[PDB]
Symmetry: D2
Subunit: 456 residues, 4 copies
Amino acid sequence: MNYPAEPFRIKSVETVSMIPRDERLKKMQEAGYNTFLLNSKDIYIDLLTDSGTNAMSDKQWAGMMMGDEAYAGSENFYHLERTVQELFGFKHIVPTHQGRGAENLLSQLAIKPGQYVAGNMYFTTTRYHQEKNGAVFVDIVRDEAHDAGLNIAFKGDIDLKKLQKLIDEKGAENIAYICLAVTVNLAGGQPVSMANMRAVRELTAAHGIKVFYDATRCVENAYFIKEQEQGFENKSIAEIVHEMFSYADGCTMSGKKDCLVNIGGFLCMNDDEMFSSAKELVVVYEGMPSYGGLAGRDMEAMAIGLREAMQYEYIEHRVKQVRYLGDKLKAAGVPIVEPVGGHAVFLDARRFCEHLTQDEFPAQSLAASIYVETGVRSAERGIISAGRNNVTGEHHRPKLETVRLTIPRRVYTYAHMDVVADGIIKLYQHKEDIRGLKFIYEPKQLRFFTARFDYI
Amino acid sequence: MNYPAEPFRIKSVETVSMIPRDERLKKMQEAGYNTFLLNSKDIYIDLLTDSGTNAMSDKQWAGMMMGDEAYAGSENFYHLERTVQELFGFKHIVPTHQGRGAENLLSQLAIKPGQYVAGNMYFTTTRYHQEKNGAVFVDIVRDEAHDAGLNIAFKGDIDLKKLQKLIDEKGAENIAYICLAVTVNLAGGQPVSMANMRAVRELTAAHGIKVFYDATRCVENAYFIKEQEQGFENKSIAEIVHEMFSYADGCTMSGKKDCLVNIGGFLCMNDDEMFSSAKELVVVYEGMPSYGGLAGRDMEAMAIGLREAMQYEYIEHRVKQVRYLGDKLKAAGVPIVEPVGGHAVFLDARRFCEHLTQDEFPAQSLAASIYVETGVRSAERGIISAGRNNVTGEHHRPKLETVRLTIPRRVYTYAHMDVVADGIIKLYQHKEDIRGLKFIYEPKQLRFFTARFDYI
Amino acid sequence: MNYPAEPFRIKSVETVSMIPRDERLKKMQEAGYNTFLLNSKDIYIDLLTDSGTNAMSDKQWAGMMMGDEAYAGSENFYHLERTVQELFGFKHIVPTHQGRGAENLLSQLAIKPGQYVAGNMYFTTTRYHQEKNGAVFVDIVRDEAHDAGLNIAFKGDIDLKKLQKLIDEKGAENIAYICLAVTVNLAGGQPVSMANMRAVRELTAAHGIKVFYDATRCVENAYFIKEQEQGFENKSIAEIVHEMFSYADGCTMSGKKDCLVNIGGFLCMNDDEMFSSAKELVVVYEGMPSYGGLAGRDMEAMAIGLREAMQYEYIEHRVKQVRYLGDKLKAAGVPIVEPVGGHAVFLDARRFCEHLTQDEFPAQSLAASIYVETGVRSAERGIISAGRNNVTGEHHRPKLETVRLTIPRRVYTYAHMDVVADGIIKLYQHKEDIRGLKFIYEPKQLRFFTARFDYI
Amino acid sequence: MNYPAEPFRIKSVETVSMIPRDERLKKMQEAGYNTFLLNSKDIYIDLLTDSGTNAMSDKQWAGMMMGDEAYAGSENFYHLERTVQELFGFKHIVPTHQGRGAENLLSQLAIKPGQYVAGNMYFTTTRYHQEKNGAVFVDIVRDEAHDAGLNIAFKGDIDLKKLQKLIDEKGAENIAYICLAVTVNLAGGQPVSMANMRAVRELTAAHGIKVFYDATRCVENAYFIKEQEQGFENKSIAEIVHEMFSYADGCTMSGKKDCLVNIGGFLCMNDDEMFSSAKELVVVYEGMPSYGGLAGRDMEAMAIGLREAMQYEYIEHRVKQVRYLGDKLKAAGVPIVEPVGGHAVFLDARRFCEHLTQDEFPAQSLAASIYVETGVRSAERGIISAGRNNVTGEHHRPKLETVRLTIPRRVYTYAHMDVVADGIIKLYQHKEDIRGLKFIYEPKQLRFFTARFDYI
Ligand SMILES: CSCC/C(=[NH+]\C=C1\C(COP(=O)(O)O)=CNC(C)=C1[O-])C(=O)O
Ligand SMILES: CSCC/C(=[NH+]\C=C1\C(COP(=O)(O)O)=CNC(C)=C1[O-])C(=O)O
Ligand SMILES: CSCC/C(=[NH+]\C=C1\C(COP(=O)(O)O)=CNC(C)=C1[O-])C(=O)O
Ligand SMILES: *Cc1c(COP(=O)(O)O)cnc(C)c1O
Ligand SMILES: [Cs+]
Ligand SMILES: [Cs+]
Ligand SMILES: [Cs+]
Ligand SMILES: [K+]
Ligand SMILES: [K+]
Ligand SMILES: [K+]
Ligand SMILES: [K+]
């Protein structure tokens, strides 16, 4: 089916208030037209992020009643360890409270100042931890990933020529590791093919270079391989996931994404010495090697959720629900990043509001308009989030000026997607009426989080 | 909007699954062709009943952690008592484990042998408890309620002329009480108007006759009043519910329906002497006046759920989701009871299976065939449910021979409704293949729950 | 050990509080001097009953998250059925919402008017359901069970000479069944020996008489057999339980006692025809044969809890905690029933209040005074609970006039027992101050639950 | 009363079990003679730590069902913020996943390399984060705190003469801050007086020096003030807590101790600029300022638990239960730190094992022997925990060489305390059998968590 029915039914609901437009207008004004400042209690459909916002199952909630809260050696850790060893195939696992805790550990362990880390684009926290430990980041994604309207498969793949070039100019010993993300968030949630993972593994192995995956959306990635990569159409999601990680030396994982939980993460590796070093550091920042900054019940929920994520029908519906939203927007002529990724639809606010300049913050204003008209919260991912250059005093000015519609797993229905699409499309039909915004309060940094605006 | 989105988010899920047709065939035969004897694990979408199958909210589950399990005087009872007094306006409440526990109490307290109980169409458990305590049941619903295809508003209303005739012929002193159900389950979930409730109060009061409501689906009923009865368009659900019960002397309630719970019921009354007598009897069959055969946590969940049911957007969506299923079926030519009711779509098995007579149990057989071909469980609501005449020994022969696609509250989506509709539409194309059934095992009362059949 | 430490630790708590004596004095008067009418919030330590007040385990709470709420054929029902078949050995099980629901079914199914039901001491609800269906109750417990100060083992045993005499004088065909309770609640929680169960099985089987066990405290009973009956010292609790029920034709069970739950019960039987008849009747009063007036989650919790109860260390501690309280009271000279039983310490109110006659309700008044002086709630188990003779209308006058300090399972500690003992010992020092009581409101049956009194 | 009963009842339980001594010996060897490396399932009574091992209440578990998992603006964050502002009085709060996450933030924000941080005794994670960010730690606790057997009140107080000397010798501008811990963990859980907090505030304020409290066991501290500091006898715990923090510029908190939770912490500060800088840094390591590496449900549970901790009867019982264990050990001749602290009994391994030198790690070996002989897990708090001197490379050599019997809140009973005491008393009778240890694996920091040893 183009759009399958949910492969689950509802066990329990999160109630919502359903406040009307006049009241949403006041809330948006009180939030200074910044959706990051809205109160959760005032939001009907919250698409700010797919991170930690997922609905758990009955089996996960049963596990939440079985937390072994011991400081060391919790049975829940051994359940998580066994599950990750089975499904990802790595020899060793260290729990962390979420993904950036694992990134902190990996970058401290595997980078020397001056070295390079090359990846298929970057994620904000991952690159910060690389750079804070002295690495220079090099983007080795295929050029195609940067073209928003290019509707091609496996747009997240690494350009092997860029990787060969880096090796030739800088030298293998000066490359700390390759950071291969699945899927690639900044490209719109675009997958990487098994062929590319295998090819990257072959080239790096010939030079002794390590490859660590950013595995946060690896199950969405596996679905794209099953659906679209020749030869994988009849492999199980689990078989695909296991093969993907066979081409890596380790990974960082945010369980808050594809492990179907509200908190949790981990670091995996095959190397024994790196495992020992990682355990010496986890106690500094997170907790013991057997809890990593998580309650026992959360290790249990993450173990159960990662296994639930292997169900084909679950991940097919997850990805096709996102696709449903993107397809409805595209059919109405709304410009989006293509093809639709695994976890989100991205609106091109620059083209949505061509009557405004980027200095008038069209993505921020479009996000405000979306909430007023529908009760849906979306994330600004444009000039505001890019920040300001404190040296020159001017904005960093991003290539992509977007509004991100990020879909939590198992929370919403197709009818909710219709609410989102209908409101965005109605606005698009009168896009000229969307007003530009100006700062009335701007902090020196983290400005997306607390900045306040008014209409021009 | 014809079909609004869910006015809630999913908080937790439960997986669904389908087994092959050949296995479904074997299971239906093992169940003696009675869907009530099928196992839950073998059902894909379970529409047997809206009773006790509802999804609770986060607030209800929080209450489930606050059970005061004391044998007497639980705080959860006082919460339930205060909530029901506020929302229904009755002086006194006695909890019961579900609705038929309240019916047992009412029928023992209020019936002397030989008296008449008059109601707007029978219900199975209700009529049995009336008859077993010596009453003769008299149907005083309007004739239109028995005409499946007649689309008129408030089909559940009592015909005041039938009520007056009963009074004239039998004498008011020989009427135990009037049983006024809202909505009327077996007419198709058909509502009763506020005008009719007021008229019934006025007429019975003039003779000193008591009126006890069956409140099991009273919130669905209040929605129809708000949607369709002149002068109520702007009144709140809670205001409508409170006025409804101001025309009654008490009620029986299965909380398992409109109180959004999985277990629970209660008996309400205004009269002090009847309350004292009800308390003397609740301890025989159920438990204390302050637990009534329920865990404390379940009184808490029922208190919270009844209040949640008062939210307009919740009940509007509940009813319109059922309407969506019926609309799709009717447009494809599948015969149904009209208008669609509050809790279920009722297939008209007489028209679906015109090649069978009612003595060949077309609704029972249709329910079986639906399961074999689709994995969807539905309920017989026809000659089998109607039972035997307790005087003549022949079958009761209701004009309505129907199969009920019964929708649990807050469990399924519109996509699930589409799956159900598509499968029934396909069965309809070969309706002539549905075979007649005959009894092989017939219980002595309430036979539909466990009877077994074989094909003719 | 005499008093082992708890074989569990605390997973979660509920706060308790003492209120001032002047407030307890007013509350006791407002409750008509009946502890059953006090509110839970006003009780410091609530020893009214061990029924439904137990603390569940983490594993049971995990099961509570796995409720299959289907109206028919829930997986939780099948888990309960498999568990009871394995542990008790009966062919068939019908769930009920609690014990008296099972008693209603058994008494309606198995009693013809005028027949005799013989049991090892009456119980309140049990006797009412026997008499309501037309039986004469005959006490066949050994005479010793009625003597509070007689410290002998297996005081609950049936006197075979009394059973033989009933058979000889009345005829076996006029005996509906034998009710064999394990333990015997109102004798003080006194166990029945395996030898006695065997002897009763042999005599009844020879005459075609059925024996239905009251299984409500069967695990406590098994502990006494393991501890004290020659030849069972090395048998497991589970082995003992399974052998006990091999001597029975079925059982009634309030799961609210030894199944470690807050709600639940069942009726078991080996006879297929009685099973069919019981299923035809359960739908009238309780629910389907596959839910019986319980939520699916509650069938799950009861299945888990009954298995947990088989753990030796759990039941040893359970019984020895009760013994600790009784030993401390006896050592201070407070008169109690001996030996101490499995679930409660029974104060001998005839001796505690020697200055009152039984017609002045000394047990009822002692329970009131305990609450006033200590904040501890306890239960009358004497003339009030015994009820009125259903032939003469005079009080039944049990030799045992007692107040029951009933201990919920896994709820309280030895320190709480010390508080209870200390308070009762202090009251004993001025026992002459306890005033006699008289009825001001008397229910027509089961009067102890809600009767109100005033001081003479 | 010396030893009050628990001011709560048990709501739910978790089983406990013991493996036999021969198996414990093998497990201890496999764990390299480090109790931190034992598995939870192999422990009978787990007194490794009071961190994150607490039993939550029914009200907290209700909150766990009300998690608002939104990435920003969660109701649970606002509840936590409001609660901490009310109870502690600080202007701003940043959540962290646990205490060392807050320490990471404070140390990075408030320390210029080379500056001094002065505290009332070191703590392991705290000192590591101070030193990693370039500070020199200076102990300014009163000398008596290092004297295990000296029973004096408020042993945790700062010696103002030592603080004045640091100011005079080093200059106020070279002191990053004072770290004032309540209670002082490694001194034995010893409290700080309000008078001392006031005097420290006055002296630091006169020199412009900031004071940040370690609030982890502040409620235990407040109890000691109420019980023993003149003038506080009739002040509530909450009033005491609020006054305590009025003398601070901010705090770090591990909620896993006195906030009665299994995960969670926070950083508070009054300074607006530090708050802005902390929000910029929390995103790097923990998460948004709106969740700080915690699920919404955990912010909710922490807010509820901190408020519950203010109940006098709860904290009185908490501290007196620890005192019960210490009193029993002391009376039997077992050497302990005196007076007993708020959260643990500290055995004095220097006196327990006088046949060993500190260089043979007597505390580490005593903890191993305790587990082997009793199944009780305890923590080394001596030379191993003290770590290496980061200037000389030699062991730090604390005067206090102790083993900590750390009591989780609301988990164990006095009967469990008796078991612990009896086993340690028995081991003391053959104390000469405890063998010295040597490192076989030493982590580079926080070595006590994962080091491995062998017998000399
Ligand atoms: C499968 S027939 C049993 C369940 C069921 N209805 C129950 C009702 C009861 C009895 O209430 P309860 O089941 O004892 O709580 C009383 N009045 C009405 C109007 C009812 O609809 C249904 O599927 O429609
Ligand atoms: C406050 S008197 C009611 C509670 C209670 N006992 C109940 C019993 C029942 C009825 O079971 P249920 O209460 O209907 O589940 C049957 N057999 C026995 C042996 C019982 O002890 C008690 O406090 O001792
Ligand atoms: C086993 S050593 C770790 C656990 C532990 N203490 C932790 C503390 C932290 C760190 O807090 P966190 O553990 O990161 O939440 C800060 N200040 C104090 C005073 C602490 O006692 C203990 O057992 O005593
Ligand atoms: C969200 C994210 C992370 C960081 O994980 P957290 O759990 O939020 O700390 C890292 N990489 C990618 C690709 C992410 O999307
Ligand atoms: Cs669709
Ligand atoms: Cs004891
Ligand atoms: Cs004690
Ligand atoms: K979250
Ligand atoms: K924990
Ligand atoms: K209960
Ligand atoms: K149910």
